[PDB]
Nucleic acid binder design. Structure first.
Lengths: 206, 100, 141, 143, 145, 82, 63
RNA sequence: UUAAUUGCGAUAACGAACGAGACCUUAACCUACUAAAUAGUGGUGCUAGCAUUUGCUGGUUAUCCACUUCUUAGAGGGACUA
RNA sequence: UGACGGAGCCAGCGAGUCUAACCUUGGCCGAGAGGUCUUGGUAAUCUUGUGAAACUCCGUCGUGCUGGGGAUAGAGCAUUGUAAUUAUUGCUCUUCAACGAGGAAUUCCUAGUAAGCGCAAGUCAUCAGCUUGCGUUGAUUACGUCCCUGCCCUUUGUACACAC
């Protein structure tokens, strides 16, 4: 192998990443494993993409919307609350800034924090409505791992939208601070408080 | 003369046969010409309520008329062009010739 | 006499046509270099091919793309499909089929839309509602 | 190495060219600027008071260069936006033609833009010849 | 990037023609507190006075405002083309003018009273309080009296 | 007559927007030990005005103490070099 | 209490007032041959891993 | 088993008709008797930048030359639970 | 995730000329509007290579009844209209008015749908918050159930029969 230069100017940073192996620019999309095997094959890994904008066909098959990249799934639930429907062009911008903000804190791998956050706020058990004789009780039922990720993404994205609303905090930085506390475990993050609150109420209404 | 005969019918089958027999009749004279040019179809949409009065669910029927325009470029003398166009005249099809 | 191939990629309503020849390793879109769209989100989208198989197939090939129709993100999708097909068709005619069937296998594995134009055309709107399936409002009293 | 216009960025060009026009001070603006709406849909004038016209001239100069023939009404559409008619839903609204018209005759006045056949404007020879000094800063710094 | 030393000369309030004008905010949007001069008028009067647009209402000298008020008082003196002003070709005089903080209500009362005195359709409507610009009164305007 | 309101309380925010020496040298000595520095970080920790936060941020990058990583609008991500 | 991890082996069917939950037969990850039948609130499928906040429960129906 | 009085089939019923379906309209690969320079043109003519080494855009108007894979829709086409 | 100021600009349906001034193309200085001229295609080469709103580098205020404010008044400038005063409509200027994730209740929705956005056509004497079409950006479950109000079939009870 002998390296040669090109008359056409193409940036080196993109070229250097492409030359040896597949990887993000500085982010380590590899070894983002989760210690909990319950959600394995329900959070997206081993298919690193270069951005959270892939128009993956998610309506053709029952679950192909669940094989969606977990960052793209996080990007989609942030794309909500009325005037932000559509506009994925910025929904990826916030995650770009949030990942930047996540990196500058918590010096470990920025992606692992998100997946640890999602794996930490998925409600392990909640309670469902039972009619009974008019009104008797509520019954606690187990939660599938796919339902977990649906709720884990939601609570993180609901908390961020409700935290940056009518305050100084931008949607990018506050969506980070919800993921910081969700991944580490603080019992104050919007996702975590609701997760155990739903779990607590399910315990009482077994 | 650089004639350009035009065709502005609606029935495609009537247009396609009369244009096919305009090329073969012009080619049987061993004259120069261009093949047909297929212009985009021009659908004319009339969207109207179905009810005569103003009662009922708001149901609408959309009528469409398809317009197919075709032109073929020829360079043939008029003393044979006149006897070329007027023959095999087809009902419903609109075969017309222009000068310059 | 110059080895060339003209191909197309498509999107919802975008279409990019690529002229791929044996040139100087240049990639251009709409008269401008592909590297200077710079919105920092879709730079990697048009970079995906050369980022995953490298420049070993981009050394002496000049590619110019003319995309029209659709929007910004749609045009970029078409651009990727145009350059993807051009490299596919280029190694189909001139280079060994071994090179083409291996790059198709990597392109398919990474993203099916790198080879297949998305068959998700829009649904026409119907009367009695604001959209295709949404209705206006049902009032009862 | 080879020199071409489009092989550089678009965002830094418009600003750098405007600073070139502002520093030279030869655009020959009559001066009634900073008065008019600049667009009937735009309810506030530009914030960049000392500029907003060197950039607009820079904006049209790149725009006329990449196009072949353009008109006063066409550039009003390009620079127009949506007018907020309060409760009424938004609608596209064209910009005032004087700002666009007098920014082109200024380009004619200084030699950037020449009249073209079939109506409209065109990138002139003098307009293109000064882009070499424009791109010089970009090429020298990165290489 | 530019930084300044903040002294006690900062004025948390400004007195322009017997009206309290806020400090610690943009001069352009501070003048909107005056009845008759708003976002655009403050933009023009600040352009005429050649005051730095980036500066606040805190570090503004008395002379800088004295020209601002002079422009507000007599806009036509500074060669204004008579399409920015809120009162062009007054019915009482025919000459171009511009209403003030207290003059805008005085002339609004004066222009409403002349319609009332002549018993015009508009004047009887203002005397009635109903809509005068043709708006339907069947649906809108129930919790207003 | 009912107006269907809630009318919650307020915190009476006091964001100062013209900064004096006491704030100027406070932020100068406190821009260290801050892992993430932004416009909202300045106003929610040193209680400065919103425009001061972005202007001060431009001042801290002009001389250079806090090294920016992402220069995007609507979200400024600056770290401190170490 | 140390929670337990469990893998489904069979799915029985939808139950509840609106069918929003499903009966599943589930095998314990450690000390297998210990069957259990649990109700799952979300969409579940074969060979899916289930978390149980408690273990020794068996809800055969839900109405 | 039905997004089907749809079929398989016990069968005092047999054979039928209507409805469903079938039918009609769109997206899109035929690259050969579906294109004019009414669309990238493959070579006209030169002008505005650097390399005398290999680009980035504008074009008079019936010489054209092995011209058609993109919004253009005919003839064996194609997707029938392969 | 938001207003404003730049700036970058990218679709698709579609329409447009006889007792014709409709389709605002450029050379009307004019400057929202429309009088000058029409050089303009049996409407791809003219509006429109739809050259548009949305969207998207960079900067202006920073959480306030604030640049979220023509909602409501007054003053003026224009064109269609033998004629608009109960704004025809567009344009420029002043002040905040209610409004701060809206109660019981309720509607629509299973894909490039919903939702955001805007454009052509019908109406039209210019200019419509409606409709019809559309196209741009593009979300959570789809192994669903009948308990959630109603359909289909069957069996069964009826003192019902235009029939609970």
């Amino acid at each position: 192998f002998t390296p040669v230069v090109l008359a056409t100017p193409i940036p080196e940073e993109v070229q250097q990443a492409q030359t040896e192996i597949k990887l993000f620019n500085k982010w380590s999309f590899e070894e983002v494993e989760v210690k909990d095997a319950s959600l394995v094959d329900y959070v997206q890994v081993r298919q690193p993409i270069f951005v959270a904008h892939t128009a993956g066909r998610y309506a053709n098959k029952r679950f192909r919307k669940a094989q969606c990249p977990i960052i793209e799934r996080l990007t989609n639930s942030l794309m909500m609350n009325g005037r932000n429907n559509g506009k994925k062009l910025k929904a990826v911008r916030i995650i770009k800034h949030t990942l930047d903000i996540i990196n500058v804190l918590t010096d470990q791998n920025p992606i692992q924090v998100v997946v640890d956050a999602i794996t930490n706020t998925g409600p392990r058990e909640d309670t469902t409505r039972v009619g009974g004789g008019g009104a008797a009780r509520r019954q606690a039922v187990d939660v599938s791992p796919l339902r977990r990720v649906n709720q884990a993404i939601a609570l993180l994205t609901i908390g961020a939208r409700e935290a940056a609303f009518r305050n100084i905090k931008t949607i990018a930085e506050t969506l980070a601070e919800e993921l910081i506390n969700a991944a580490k475990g603080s019992s104050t993050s919007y996702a975590i408080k609701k997760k155990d609150e739903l779990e607590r109420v399910a315990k009482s209404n077994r | 003369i650089k004639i350009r005969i035009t065709l502005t019918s609606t029935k495609v089958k009537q247009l396609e046969n009369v244009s096919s027999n305009i090329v073969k009749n012009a080619e049987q004279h061993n004259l120069v010409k261009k093949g047909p040019v297929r212009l985009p179809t021009k659908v004319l949409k009339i969207s109207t309520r179905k009810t005569p009065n103003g009662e009922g669910s708001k149901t609408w029927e959309t009528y469409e008329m398809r317009i197919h325009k075709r032109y073929i470029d020829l360079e043939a003398p008029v003393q044979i062009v006149k006897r070329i166009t007027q023959i095999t005249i087809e009902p419903g099809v609109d075969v017309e010739v222009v000068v310059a | 006499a110059v080895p060339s191939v003209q191909t197309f990629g498509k999107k919802k309503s975008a279409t990019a046509v690529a002229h791929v020849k044996a040139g100087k390793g240049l990639i251009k879109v709409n008269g401008s270099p592909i590297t200077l769209v710079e919105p920092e989100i879709l730079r990697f989208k048009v970079y995906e091919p050369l980022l995953l198989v490298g420049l070993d197939k981009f050394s002496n090939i000049d590619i110019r793309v003319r995309v029209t129709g659709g929007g910004h993100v749609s045009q970029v999708y078409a651009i990727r499909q145009a350059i993807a097909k051009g490299l596919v068709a280029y190694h189909q005619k001139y280079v060994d089929e071994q090179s083409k069937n291996e790059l198709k296998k990597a392109f398919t594995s990474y993203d099916r839309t790198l080879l297949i134009a998305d068959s998700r055309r829009p649904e026409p709107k119907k009367f009695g509602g604001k959209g295709a399936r949404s209705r206006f409002q049902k009032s009862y009293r | 190495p080879g020199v071409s216009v489009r092989d550089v960025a678009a965002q830094d060009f418009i600003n750098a060219y405007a600073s070139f026009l502002q520093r030279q001070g030869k655009l020959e603006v009559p001066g009634y600027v900073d008065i008019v709406k600049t667009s009937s849909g735009n309810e506030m004038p530009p914030q960049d008071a000392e500029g907003w016209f060197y950039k607009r001239a820079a904006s049209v100069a790149r725009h006329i260069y990449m196009r072949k023939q353009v008109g006063v009404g066409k550039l009003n559409k390009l620079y127009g936006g949506a007018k907020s008619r309060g409760v009424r839903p938004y609608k596209h609204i064209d910009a005032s033609g004087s700002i666009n018209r007098k920014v082109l005759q200024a380009l004619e006045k200084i030699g950037i833009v020449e009249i073209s056949p079939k109506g409209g404007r065109r990138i002139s020879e003098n307009g293109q010849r000064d882009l070499d000094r424009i791109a010089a800063q970009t090429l020298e710094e990165d290489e | 990037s530019l930084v300044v030393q903040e002294q006690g000369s900062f004025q948390h309030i400004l007195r322009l023609l017997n009206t309290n004008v806020d400090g610690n905010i943009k001069i352009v949007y501070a003048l909107t507190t005056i009845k008759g001069v708003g976002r655009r008028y403050s933009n023009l009067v600040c352009k005429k006075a050649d005051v730095d647009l980036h500066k606040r209402a805190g570090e503004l000298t008395q002379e800088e405002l004295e020209r601002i008020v002079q422009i507000m008082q007599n806009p036509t003196h500074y060669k204004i083309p008579a399409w920015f002003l809120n009162r062009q070709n007054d019915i009482t005089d025919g000459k171009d003018y511009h209403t003030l903080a207290n003059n805008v209500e005085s002339k609004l009362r004066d222009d409403l009273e002349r319609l009332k005195k002549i018993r015009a359709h508009r004047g009887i409507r203002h005397f009635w309080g109903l809509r005068v610009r043709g708006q339907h009164t069947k649906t809108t305007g129930r919790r207003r009296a | 007559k009912k107006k269907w309101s809630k009318k919650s309380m307020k915190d009476r925010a006091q964001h100062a927007v013209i900064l004096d020496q006491e704030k100027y040298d406070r932020i100068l000595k406190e821009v260290p030990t801050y892992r993430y520095v932004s416009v909202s970080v300045l106003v929610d920790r040193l209680k400065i005005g919103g425009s001061l936060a972005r202007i001060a941020l431009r001042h801290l990058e002009k001389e250079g103490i806090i090294k920016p990583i992402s220069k995007h609008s609507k979200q400024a991500i600056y770290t401190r070099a170490t | 209490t140390p929670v337990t991890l469990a893998k489904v082996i069979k799915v029985l069917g939808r139950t509840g007032s609106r069918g929003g939950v499903t009966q599943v037969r589930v095998e314990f990850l450690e000390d297998t041959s210990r069957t259990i039948v649990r109700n799952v609130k979300g969409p579940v499928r074969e060979n899916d891993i289930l978390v149980l906040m408690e273990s020794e429960r068996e809800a055969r129906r839900l109405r």
